[PDB]
Amino acid sequence: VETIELKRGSNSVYVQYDDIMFFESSTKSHRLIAHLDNRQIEFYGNLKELSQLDDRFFRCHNSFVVNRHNIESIDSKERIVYFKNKEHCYASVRNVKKI
DNA sequence: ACAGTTAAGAAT
DNA sequence: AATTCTTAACTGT
């Protein structure tokens, strides 16, 4: 069991670490979006604390924390991180080396 | 180094 | 249970 509580104010949703492809910032202030296989969950959190949960969670961009276990491939020239579910996000110039 | 954008603290 | 203001730290080139 590697469970994370995604706190939502009137409720919480619980997911496994490896259900999560990546996290990004929401356009709602102080919310993030957890990208699961084919669902997304909005919750209260910050990307910094998620990257500190576990070494699989890597801060590849100011707006993205990726789950290394669910990365399918990486285009290092375009700085695109592709996930097993066929979503993608971006790594910043300063962080792309380290993924 | 630069001009523009944004994550997350403080308050409530 | 959510929202704004704020500003240091980030962004790509």
From Swiss-Prot:
Limits of the HTH LytTR-type domain: 4-99
Compartment(s) where it occurs, according to its Swiss-Prot or TrEMBL record: Cytoplasm
Stated role: Required for high-level post-exponential phase expression of a series of secreted proteins.
Protein name, as recorded: Accessory gene regulator A
Whole-protein residues included: 140 to 238 of 238
